[PDB]
Design a protein around this nucleic acid. Sequence first.
DNA 1: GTGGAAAATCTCTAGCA
DNA 2: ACTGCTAGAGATTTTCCAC
DNA 3: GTGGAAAATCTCTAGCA
DNA 4: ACTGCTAGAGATTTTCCAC
Lengths: 47, 47, 260, 242, 260, 242, 65, 65
Amino acid sequence: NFRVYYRDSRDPVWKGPAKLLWKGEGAVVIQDNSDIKVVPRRKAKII
Amino acid sequence: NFRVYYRDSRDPVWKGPAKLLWKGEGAVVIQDNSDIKVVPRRKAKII
Amino acid sequence: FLDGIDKAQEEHEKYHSNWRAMASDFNLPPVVAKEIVASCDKCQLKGEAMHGQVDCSPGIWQLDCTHLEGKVILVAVHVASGYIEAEVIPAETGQETAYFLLKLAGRWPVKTVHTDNGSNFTSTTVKAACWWAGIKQEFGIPYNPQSQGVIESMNKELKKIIGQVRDQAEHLKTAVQMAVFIHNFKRKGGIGGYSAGERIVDIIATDIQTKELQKQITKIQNFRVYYRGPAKLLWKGEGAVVIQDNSDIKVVPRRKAKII
Amino acid sequence: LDGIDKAQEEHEKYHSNWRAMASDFNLPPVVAKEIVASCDKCQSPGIWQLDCTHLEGKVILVAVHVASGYIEAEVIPAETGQETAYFLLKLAGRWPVKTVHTDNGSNFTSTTVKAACWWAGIKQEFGVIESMNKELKKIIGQVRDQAEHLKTAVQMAVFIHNFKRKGGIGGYSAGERIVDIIATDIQTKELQKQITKIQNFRVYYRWKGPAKLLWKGEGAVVIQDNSDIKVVPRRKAKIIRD
Amino acid sequence: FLDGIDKAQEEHEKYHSNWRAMASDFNLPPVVAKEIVASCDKCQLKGEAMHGQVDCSPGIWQLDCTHLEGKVILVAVHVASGYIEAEVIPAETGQETAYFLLKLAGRWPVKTVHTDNGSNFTSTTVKAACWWAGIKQEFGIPYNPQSQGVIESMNKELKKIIGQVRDQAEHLKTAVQMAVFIHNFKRKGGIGGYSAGERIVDIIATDIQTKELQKQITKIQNFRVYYRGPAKLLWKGEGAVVIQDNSDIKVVPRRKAKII
Amino acid sequence: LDGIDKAQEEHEKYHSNWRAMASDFNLPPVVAKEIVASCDKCQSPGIWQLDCTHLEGKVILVAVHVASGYIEAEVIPAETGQETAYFLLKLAGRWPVKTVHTDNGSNFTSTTVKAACWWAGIKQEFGVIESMNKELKKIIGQVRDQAEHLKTAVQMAVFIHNFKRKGGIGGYSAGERIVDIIATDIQTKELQKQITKIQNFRVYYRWKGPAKLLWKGEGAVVIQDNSDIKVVPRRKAKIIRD
Amino acid sequence: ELQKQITKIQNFRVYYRDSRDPVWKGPAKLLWKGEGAVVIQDNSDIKVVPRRKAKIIRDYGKQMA
Amino acid sequence: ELQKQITKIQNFRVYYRDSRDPVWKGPAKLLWKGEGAVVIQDNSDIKVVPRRKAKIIRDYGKQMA
DNA sequence: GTGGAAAATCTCTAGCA
DNA sequence: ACTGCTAGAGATTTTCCAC
DNA sequence: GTGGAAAATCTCTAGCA
DNA sequence: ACTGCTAGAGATTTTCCAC
Ligand SMILES: C[C@@H]1CCO[C@H]2Cn3cc(C(=O)NCc4ccc(F)cc4F)c(=O)c(O)c3C(=O)N12
Ligand SMILES: C[C@@H]1CCO[C@H]2Cn3cc(C(=O)NCc4ccc(F)cc4F)c(=O)c(O)c3C(=O)N12
Ligand SMILES: [Mg+2]
Ligand SMILES: [Mg+2]
Ligand SMILES: [Mg+2]
Ligand SMILES: [Mg+2]
Ligand SMILES: [Zn+2]
Ligand SMILES: [Zn+2]
């Protein structure tokens, strides 16, 4: 299991933790309360 | 003699050539038409 | 020790001291202090210091709309080469972008357009135009301009050129075309010492040439290779063989490789 | 080394060009270019033609690359000097226009178009054109129902004509042909640049008489004295600039 | 050749082609092509890719006003250490900043105040306050925030901490004080593994201690060095000697060095 | 190594502290601490005092560092729990407050001030104070004309009292004294941290009985078996954490 | 001609990149082009660079030299 | 005790920097402190660093060990 | 193999909304 | 399931010219 | 002298108006 | 005549622990 703390878009406040669905190079696909989002890894922290 | 082309402050348009009066580490003191200015070397080019 | 973890948690709840502070003050291992910090949601306020890389395939074009003197300039850049086509359009509308894209597809082999989510790139007219010309449509992550890092850069470079030729053109469209000309054919540098136009010609010509040569070699150089499964040969040379193993290309020395 | 006599003999018996003699014998292209430039018996890519085709009260400016059949077609508001100058500026920006052919029309001879040709470097001059324009007209007639405006139909026809009409020597579209032709032109320009770069050097071997330099290599220096291309070790020949 | 540079000049006057394009197309040395480019004013649109360094003396403080939740926070940072004093003020006024600086001088040895040119910092009240307390007033180049990098950075960091403790203080002043406390005494790291408060204590104590020791040594270790004028000896050892040569400190091997 | 006997004898005949030995005989501070702690016959910096001074209808909260005479004085709008809690939070943020002495006043025993002490970690408790307050009165009177407000006068007086006033054992100002005292406190904290870090280790020399580790040096391991601080080569002593 | 078409394929230059390095690697020698990956050889090191990170050219300033 | 005072002044750590390097160099040994410059020794290399680029501390964590 | 100018390589920054 | 880059300005390093 | 976890060091980025 | 920095997140490299 992975916890992703992410900054989706133009929102300084961070969110999470969100379930991690896919991890690539520069993009993590995460599920936060059934909402699927793509976050650049500069704006996502995985634990 | 040195020609200094500088971007002084909040003015994307570059200016010059001006006359170099003093060169330091990260700051050049220049004379543009009797107007003395201080410019960071990130915003000044010397020839 | 493990009872100092409770005091570390209690101090983290108020002060949110970083792992080093807790390790030093409460005499804890780095691992335990780091774990305590990693258990707090309010201390997770930083991503990883990295930068991905954009797609550099020969058939990907990056599009974006810039604004100069109250006029919309639609700019497209060939990512693999740096060759830009720009045009001043009346208003940032989906139809203008669709016309620009249809023009582009007929002059160069656009196999994919990478764009931001702007109201003029997600339109249905652009979708239909892409469907007609067989263009794959990529959209960057919302509000992630770095994804378009190439074209945005050109918006700077292009603009710079327009600032040097503006006095030679009485209207912005002419200056934009002059800037495209200068960037493509009069500004050299880059990977091959080329200019963008020569670079794009080289990229496309090499793509076609390598495609046909590889088709020839495949039609002739046929083999089945067994190493250490019946995979397919790619390149045998210098005692090292490259083998496509069910879409898993593996390079292995000559030993433990049989080309049958 | 080795295969130079084979190159010269193959040339005299087949008068072949330098690309063939330098790809089949592995020579420095300057040396092959010199080889073909030794016998009198053995001594384009930027040519565009403009035309106006009138459909449905709209003028379409068509620029045809004569060597490739490559069309750039745009419907323009009017047959004014400004619009044709804009089309020419775009054409120069996208592809390397060197000289341009028109029909001596009123739109193709205005001071605005003259200054656009002067600025972009184009040089004005007054059966590919007719066939290609008829092909564009036919394809526009085919794909007109697929779009409302005529500009979209023109662009669809240009796309089909350039990239979906495969007819020629080996089933090649016009885009492929133009890419190949421009690549060859770039290659020629690089060769001429290298020739002009070395042509200021004079080499003495063993002295003997001066020489013309054709290639300086890591350990092989290929030079030529009186239509005699010979290779020499670097420890034998000395160059100077004059 | 030299008559082939007029064509380069003309094509530069028209297109401002960079030096590489001129050199490649017109067969010119890089030197002359770069000279042609360097002779044009329009093509001088870039500085040097460098970053100076701010003053990190033990007695320099960097000040700035930030805004949070519609409230002004005046923030001062010790550049040598990273120790921040911050306070929420009613409005951005010269008198409020003068009071803040007067408080600062009485609690820590401020020997220089570095600030942006904002209306509050350049006022006459702040000038009088600095004169009374003997503070040197330093102003960065206008619209050059990088000059104040340290304090600007602190703002970010400071704001971060507030976002973690803003649910524990009903008002912003209390949260600001909590953030200052956490940064000073609960966030370690930096150069010595210290926290900011420990770092400032160390810097100041070391300044006083080394001043005392150096005064003692100077009172004792009196020498004159005649190498290769009569310089003043500083440190002799390890086969080398350091000598102040009329305000030009020079280090020379033991040979050619006479300590009289 | 070869420096312990002199320090031990010096301490026996002078009962001196551990900094003196660690600076005169050049031993690691842990071993000097052990030497001083091995003898039973040879067995503060963070306490502040708060007070209110009423001048010109304005209450001045004064915090005195009893170890140094360092004053932090500020006029506050009223003797309210919120204002005193704000002052205490500031005092904790700037300097390391560990315990605070008050006068059991109404403003020093409010739930707000209690929770401010609890959050900042301060521990409440109910002749330096009087002398330092009187000094602040005198200096304010001296520099009350230089300002039009009592807050500015108080800050001027605090600056003068801390810095411009040089009096003491060696002619030192309160700022220098507080810096030195806090530096010594940090030193003590580091010593205790390292002692607690190593105390979980047991060393066997040459086996013999276990031992207490005092210094795992680069090339000399100093341990102590039954109040006998002896150095050993690293090829003689083996450690285990327990 | 299968031993010279191989030379033709190897006459190209592949400027590539890794997954963490932003700067473009030098001109390797194109050993094989595929729909999804390119096998190149940079200083006697056979690598399989993805297509989305490779610029294949046939630099003519060098070919005509 | 002039030698001992010399040793005391050499017991400090000077984190310094150069004109172009942004990263803070390592803990050199303070050989001399002056009004405008500090003479330090980093791996047997005597240097004169300006006062505006020097952080002189006495790391207590590294001193009490 | 030795020095000196010159070309290549490398490092680094502003700006792109 | 996707992704910062470009072009220019100094500085440093090879490299070829002449013995 | 050999591997493995751990600690130190180095590289790199967001945000500060 | 003056000047980008800081703190954190991954990755890489020493380094000590045990023979
Ligand atoms: C309304 C559309 C759709 C939604 O997003 C907005 C905002 N936006 C913002 C930038 C921008 O931030 N440019 C500066 C910049 C900064 C960093 C970098 F790496 C690249 C950069 F371009 C654009 O370029 C841009 O085109 C848009 C845009 O079009 N839109
Ligand atoms: C009206 C005063 C006087 C004239 O200047 C303005 C504008 N300004 C701008 C920034 C600013 O750009 N911050 C972002 C940022 C970006 C880069 C960096 F290195 C440091 C940074 F802080 C400030 O922080 C700031 O304090 C001011 C300010 O106070 N003023
Ligand atoms: Mg956009
Ligand atoms: Mg944009
Ligand atoms: Mg400000
Ligand atoms: Mg600011
Ligand atoms: Zn936390
Ligand atoms: Zn120019």
